[PDB]
């Protein structure tokens, strides 16, 4: 089965290609509409592998330097192996001496297409956690933020380095371990500072400090301080917003690490409770009369802060990424915090962007402690300072990458002239990654083809490691093997791989041409791989391998990802932030929400995202990635309002109402960005969230109308 081929290659190599069989000519590949691309999860969950205790082996050719893998041929009589990518001959290390065809090393086994090595760099560096705290919030929120901060402080390793910066009208860089009194260094929340300046001002040398000290050493001292932390003392006048120096406090937190611990694992965790009102990085004015930016305000160019502010964090993101540090943003407030302007910090670094109502919600506290989820051995599921190198066969060139990464601008033979997204390179830097972190790599064609994925990172246990993933797919003569290629097509993978591309363009100046381009390809695909006689829309049909793809495009073009004008800029930035991260499974849900149905007449079964599925005697469980909604049918709603549940007679009915709530509880623990929960029913004020989710190709319309137009355009 081809479905078995995909499911096994994902679970093993952490990869899913748009096509699993490749065209041997650049022409018919260009003709194929979808580029040969792949979702790639570098650190896919893999408990079946024990880390190899030894250095990897590399090809002698410099330009190549590929890692030893099952593809390379071997001549044990000669102790030599030939690189699959370039064919250069290589010699095994002396230790590998006893190598034979029956006791061959790990990296040569097909079962070990992807494996992890243990590097012995020798510089064992501790983790670094920098807490940047906003103090312009009510005593309720700050207290709850303090509890969550004392909680996070307890999970960290004894050798990890912690630091605290608190900001408001001014920025305070506290000195810890300083017992008996409490000194802190203050700066104007209006003046920007460089890394060198702050190094000098704080009285530091070049390249544990007085600011960054061990948890074991300071657990008592820091905690007490957090305990005594109170809100911004500076009084807020009427009709005015508090003076919050978000942009400045970040530039300090970044610079503080830039001059003490450069090029080592570190998370800068900024918690904000409102918009920056005192730049640089200024989001909006201080007078409450003026409301924050509205996709409309920014579109009509009435937002005078966005361009300046975004530029600030853009440079801040590039600084932190270059130094190899992670920036997290936990924005919990009742209005926009300026996540649109700040998005590039957790976007370019592997940081988390967390949105919320307040820090005193069961929403935030839970989401925050899922950040520090430990694995089976008590080590954090985080990775730092990631270096990703991709080597391809000589007939393949890397266009570029899309997702949480930064171009290292490494030029070579594998780098395509026509570069896509983050391209012009064969190497990317991912400052922070999680077993979930997934990139989209785009390729180009010019007997099998092969691609290798090499990832160097610092494990949460201070260990340096290398994750090598070597894959291969079969070439095809697209003039004799069109059928082979069409069956290797991954309709799921292409849907996401095309979605990112489209969104990536949404980031860019290109405007609503995205819908126009997205549909042009959807039509092109239907024209090539569709079964139809010309000019007969009724004759048109799609093989099962493709059948779901137009349905995927339908929900994509109508999703919040491209239709921002019903959300706030921050929400749109948040939604796009997570989609560019997730693996295929979660990515599909975002585009096309799952809809389950519960009733007396059979088990829970997923149904169509249509109005038809909404029946009177049926409870619906809609699952978009960012929210969980339970919808009670009209009949079931009345039985619920009458009190039948409590009665011992209706044992079954109390279970029917409990069946989806039980399942809604599981998802409210597994999912890292803990979704908003909504319980509503037929005629409920919050029933709006359901029905809403249920030239250019077309306007908002039924799925059928959309297809029918697609059907008649594909046949002509």
């Amino acid at each position: 089965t081809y479905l078995e081929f995909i499911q096994q290659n994902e679970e093993r190599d952490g990869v899913r290609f748009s096509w699993n069989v490749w065209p041997s000519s650049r022409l018919e590949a260009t003709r194929m509409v979808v580029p040969v691309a792949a979702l790639f999860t570098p650190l896919k969950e893999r408990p079946d592998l024990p880390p190899i205790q030894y250095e990897p082996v590399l090809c002698s050719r410099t330009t190549c330097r590929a890692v030893l893998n099952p593809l390379c041929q071997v001549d044990y009589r000669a102790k030599l192996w030939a690189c699959n990518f370039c064919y250069q001959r290589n010699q095994f290390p002396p230790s590998y001496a006893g190598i034979s065809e029956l006791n061959q090393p790990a990296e040569l086994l097909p079962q070990f297409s992807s494996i992890e090595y243990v590097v012995l760099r020798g510089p064992q560096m501790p983790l670094i956690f920098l807490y940047v705290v906003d103090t312009c919030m009510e005593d309720e929120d700050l207290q709850a933020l303090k509890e969550s901060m004392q909680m996070s402080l307890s999970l960290l390793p004894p050798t990890a380095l912690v630091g605290l910066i608190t900001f408001g009208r001014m920025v305070q860089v506290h000195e810890l371990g300083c017992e008996g009194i409490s000194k802190s260094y203050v700066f104007r929340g209006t003046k920007d500072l460089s890394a060198k300046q702050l190094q000098e001002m704080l009285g530091l040398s070049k390249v544990s400090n007085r600011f960054l000290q061990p948890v074991q050493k300071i657990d008592m001292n820091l905690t007490d301080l957090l305990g005594e932390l109170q809100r911004d003392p500076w009084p807020v006048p009427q009709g005015k917003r508090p003076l919050r120096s978000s942009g400045v406090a970040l530039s300090i937190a970044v610079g503080l690490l830039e001059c003490t611990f450069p090029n080592t694992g570190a998370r800068i965790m900024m918690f904000i409770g409102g918009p920056a009102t005192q730049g640089p990085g200024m989001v909006v004015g201080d007078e409450l009369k003026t409301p924050i930016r509205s996709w409309h305000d920014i579109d009509k160019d009435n937002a005078k802060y966005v361009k300046k502010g975004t530029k600030h964090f853009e440079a801040l993101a590039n600084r932190a990424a270059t130094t190899g540090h992670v920036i997290d943003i936990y924005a919990c407030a009742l209005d926009q915090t300026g996540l649109l302007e700040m998005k590039c910090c957790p976007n370019l670094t592997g940081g988390y962007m967390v949105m919320g109502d307040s820090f005193n919600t069961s929403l935030f506290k839970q989401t925050f402690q899922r950040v520090f989820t430990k694995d089976m051995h008590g080590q954090f599921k985080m990775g730092f300072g990631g270096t990703l190198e991709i080597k391809t066969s000589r007939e393949i060139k890397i266009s570029g990458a899309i997702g949480p990464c930064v171009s290292l601008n490494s030029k070579g033979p594998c780098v395509s002239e026509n570069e896509i997204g983050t391209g012009g390179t064969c190497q990317w830097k991912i400052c922070g990654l999680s077993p979930t972190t997934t990139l989209a790599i785009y390729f180009e064609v010019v007997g099998r083809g092969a691609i290798q994925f090499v990832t160097q990172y610092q494990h949460s246990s201070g260990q340096r490691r290398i994750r090598v993933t070597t894959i291969a797919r079969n070439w095809a003569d697209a003039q004799t093997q069109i059928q082979n290629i069409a069956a290797s097509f991954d309709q799921e993978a292409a849907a996401i791989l095309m979605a990112r591309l489209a969104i990536y363009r949404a980031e860019t100046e290109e405007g609503p041409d995205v819908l126009r381009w997205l549909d042009r390809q959807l039509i092109r695909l239907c024209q090539k791989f569709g079964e139809y006689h010309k000019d007969d829309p009724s004759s048109f049909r799609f093989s099962e391998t493709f059948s779901l793809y137009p349905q995927f495009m339908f929900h994509l073009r109508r999703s919040s990802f491209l239709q921002v004008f019903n959300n706030s800029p921050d929400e749109s930035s948040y939604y796009r932030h997570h989609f560019m991260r997730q693996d295929l499974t979660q990515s599909l849900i975002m585009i096309q929400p799952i809809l389950y149905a519960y009733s007396f007449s059979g088990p829970p079964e997923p149904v169509l995202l249509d109005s038809s599925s909404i029946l009177a005697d049926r409870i619906l469980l809609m699952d978009t990635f960012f929210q969980i909604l339970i919808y009670h049918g009209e009949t079931i709603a009345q039985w619920r309002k009458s009190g039948y549940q409590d009665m011992p007679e209706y044992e079954n009915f109390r279970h029917l109402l409990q069946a989806p709530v039980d399942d809604a509880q599981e998802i409210l623990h597994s999912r890292f960005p803990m979704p908003r929960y909504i319980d509503t029913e037929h005629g409920g004020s919050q029933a709006r969230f359901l029905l809403s989710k249920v030239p250019i190709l077309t306007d908002d319309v039924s799925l059928q109308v959309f297809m029918d137009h697609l059907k008649k355009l594909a046949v002509s």
């Binding site: 008996g180 009194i181 000194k183 802190s184 104007r188 704080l202």
Partner: protein, 767 residues
């Protein structure tokens, strides 16, 4: 054959001492500052408050241009009134405020002639007629005594205080009580010499003694704390902290105050929290290794804090050495030597950076006064550092090469005396005059934006301002000349208040009268301040040229117009100016007007500022020291011993002497000094057993020591500075410094040299 300075002092102590001087007659002439007597207000202002060069103005400008006698007054508005004299009365005029003339804006005073039944009063100053307000009306009597004249102080007394209404306050709102901000240099220099701990430990005790009025129970003055060494260290000492918080500012150049609360807290409330800090600070910077500090930003910070608290305040700055760390107000070591023949000699007595003048203006504009306790050991550029504490009305205390086992007591005495000083805040003085003349020039620890208002951020009992008058128009021999000094300020409880001094001076058109009514001591005080101010604008040889030629011109004019005919071999001086030649010569011998050989500029700039603040009593002593014979002193006589001429000619080898100028007190010992005294004072048997370097107080002593110390205490009494005692041995010892203070000797020229120099230009002005 001239009557000495001392012959005159004692001659006036004999005929006027122990007698009551009453200020009733107009133009009356008061005793000398050296003559202690009782004073009753009774009409005009006490000489303790204000003295004049002449108590009879020339009626017209030409006449004034004849004699060339300067018309000036030395006002010490808050002089410490003796226990035995009538204290000032506080006058309240209700909502309307103090009744004033509608023209010249003179306040209600005894100089107001009430007419027309008591319904109108004619101004004594501008002769303008006013309407007596309803609530203040009263009926006249036989010649206009009005019947409450002896009842209401502002009608019968020359010195009193008005209550100021809200239209006298900043922003027309009641001011806040001032705040004492203590700021400590904590670089390596002050840590090593044990100064920091000394300041900390001792400040625990003296924060209790912070000034408070009788009507209240606890001082309304708040207290704040700061340290610095090229970086500022603020402190949070709120009355709910078990531990003081520190907030360090590094953004020097664009300074700011990182706190609004926790700074400036009532001392009694935050008592334990404060003491907790003063214990820690010496330990905190104990291992500090910094060699550079900042200064301007420190004044900048203490000023910015007082603006935020919306209150006046005083800055008690303690500093060590030359501020070199890169910042605004960064000073260099520019002691380039240019003098005597160099016109640009003045710069040396000017600040380096432009920022000090601005900084000073900002302080005065916000009611912030800075007092500087300075502990140099090298070049420090007094000209720069002392500018802001001078212009603001603050004080400067310099302790050359401070050493703990010696100058400890001197500093602590200065500190206590300065904290407990009766002080006003955010003060402005206006000197109004009657028709015919006006104030045209001012001399003090002051700053002026316009040409009428003397702004003093803070003023204490010791400070004094000297004012110069010129002829507006011709005067009247009948009405004379009137002066009204008005000081508007804020007290340590936060009340707006006016102190008023009225003084009436006679006018004559007779050159005989002017000379008859001259005070030498007061004349010197003017010439000193006038010259010391000109130092910053002209060559020193030019000013001297001016001093000598104006001295010769006054005595030539007295010779050729008033003096009954005499020989040309004689030089004729009026009894009022008997000793003006001697004192004048001593002014020219001062290092301020002398040169760099043997003297640091720092010492030249320090003394230059010191004089600018002085009153008459102080200026008399600084220029002509007091020299007491201690060997001939009777035992338990025990009246203070009589003074002896300031020269080496009055020194016996068998003699012990004390010389004091008010800042330095020297004990001098002859080589043949009687061992009976050396034992009964120094506790060592012989002369060659004493060590000069051991200049600490020899408390022990059964007969002579208690006796001798006694006379050292009374000398110090009326003096604001505690004097640096310096013991000297007669031969080739540190006598070299001591000899400078013998002002009748050559050293410039001597006395008899200058007397012959004056008599030459007195014959050059031929006719």
């Amino acid at each position: 054959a001239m009557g000495s300075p001392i012959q005159v002092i004692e001659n006036d102590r004999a005929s006027r001492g122990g007698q009551v001087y009453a200020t009733n007659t107009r133009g009356q002439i008061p005793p000398l500052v050296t003559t202690d007597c009782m004073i009753q207000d009774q009409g005009n202002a006490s000489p303790r408050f204000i003295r004049c060069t002449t108590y009879c103005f020339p009626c017209t400008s030409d006449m004034a241009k004849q004699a060339q006698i300067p018309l000036a007054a030395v006002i010490k508005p808050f002089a410490t009134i003796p226990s035995n004299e009538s204290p000032l009365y506080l006058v309240n005029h209700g909502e309307s405020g103090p009744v004033r003339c509608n023209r010249c804006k003179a306040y209600m005073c005894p100089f107001m002639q009430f007419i027309e039944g008591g319904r109108r009063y004619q101004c004594g100053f501008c002769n303008c007629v006013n309407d007596v307000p309803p609530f203040y009306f009263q009926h006249l009597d036989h010649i206009g005594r009005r019947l409450d004249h002896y009842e209401k102080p502002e009608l019968s007394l020359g010195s009193y205080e008005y209550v100021a209404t809200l239209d006298y306050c900043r922003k027309s709102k009641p001011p806040n009580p001032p705040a004492f901000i203590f700021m400590i240099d904590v670089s390596y220099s002050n840590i090593k010499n044990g100064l920091v701990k000394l300041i900390c430990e001792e400040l625990k005790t003296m924060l209790e003694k912070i000034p408070k009025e009788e009507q209240e129970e606890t001082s309304a003055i708040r207290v704040g704390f700061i340290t610095y060494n090229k970086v500022l260290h603020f402190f949070n000492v709120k009355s709910n902290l078990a531990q003081p918080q520190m907030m360090v500012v590094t953004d020097v150049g664009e300074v700011f105050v990182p706190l609004l609360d926790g700074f400036l807290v009532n001392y009694q409330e935050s008592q334990s929290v404060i003491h907790n800090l003063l214990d820690q600070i010496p330990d905190m910077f104990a291992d500090s290794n910094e060699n550079e500090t900042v200064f301007a930003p420190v004044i900048q910070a203490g000023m910015e804090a007082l603006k935020a608290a919306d209150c006046p305040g005083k800055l008690f700055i303690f500093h060590s050495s030359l501020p070199t760390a890169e910042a605004p107000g960064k000073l260099k070591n520019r002691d380039d030597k240019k003098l005597v023949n160099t016109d640009k000699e003045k710069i040396l007595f000017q600040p380096q950076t432009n920022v000090y003048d601005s900084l000073a203006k900002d302080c005065v504009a916000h009611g912030c006064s800075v007092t500087l306790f300075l502990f140099p050991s090298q070049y420090v550029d007094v000209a720069s550092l002392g500018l802001v504490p001078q212009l603001t009305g603050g004080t400067l205390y310099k302790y050359n090469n401070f050493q703990m086992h010696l100058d400890r007591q001197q500093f602590l005495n200065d500190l206590r005396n300065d904290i407990e000083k009766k002080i006003g805040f955010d003060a402005i003085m206006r000197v109004r005059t009657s028709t015919g003349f006006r104030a045209t020039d001012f001399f003090g620890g002051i700053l002026m934006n316009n040409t009428t208002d003397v702004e003093m951020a803070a003023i204490d009992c010791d400070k004094a301002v000297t004012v110069e008058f010129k002829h507006d128009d011709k005067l009247s021999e009948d009405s004379g000349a009137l002066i009204q000094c008005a000081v508007l300020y804020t007290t340590i409880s936060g009340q707006r208040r006016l102190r008023i001094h009225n003084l009436g001076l006679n006018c004559s058109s007779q050159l005989a009268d002017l000379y008859k009514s001259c005070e030498t001591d007061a004349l010197i005080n003017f010439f000193a301040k006038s010259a010391f101010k000109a130092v910053l604008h002209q060559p020193l040889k030019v000013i001297r040229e001016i001093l000598v030629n104006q001295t010769a011109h006054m005595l030539a004019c007295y010779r050729k117009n008033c003096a009954s005919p005499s020989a040309a071999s004689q030089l004729i001086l009026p009894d009022s100016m008997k000793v003006l030649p001697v004192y004048m010569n001593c002014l020219l011998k001062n290092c301020v007007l002398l040169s760099r050989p043997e003297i640091s500029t720092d010492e030249r700039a320090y003394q230059r500022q010191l004089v600018m603040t002085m009153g008459v009593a102080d200026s008399q002593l600084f220029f002509y020291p007091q020299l007491l014979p201690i060997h001939t002193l009777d035992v338990k006589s025990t009246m203070l011993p009589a003074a002896v001429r300031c020269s080496e000619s009055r020194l016996s080898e068998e003699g012990i002497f004390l010389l004091a100028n008010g800042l330095h007190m020297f004990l001098w010992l002859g080589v043949s000094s009687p061992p009976e005294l050396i034992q009964g004072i120094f506790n060592v048997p012989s002369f060659a057993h004493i060590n000069t370097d051991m200049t600490l107080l020899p408390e022990v002593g059964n007969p002579y020591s208690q006796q001798l110390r006694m006379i050292m205490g009374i000398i110090q009494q009326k003096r604001p500075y505690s004097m640096k005692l310096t013991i000297v041995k007669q031969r080739e010892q540190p006598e070299m410094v001591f000899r400078q203070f013998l002002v009748e000797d050559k050293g410039g020229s001597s006395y008899v040299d200058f007397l012959c120099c004056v008599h030459k230009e007195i014959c050059q002005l031929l006719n």
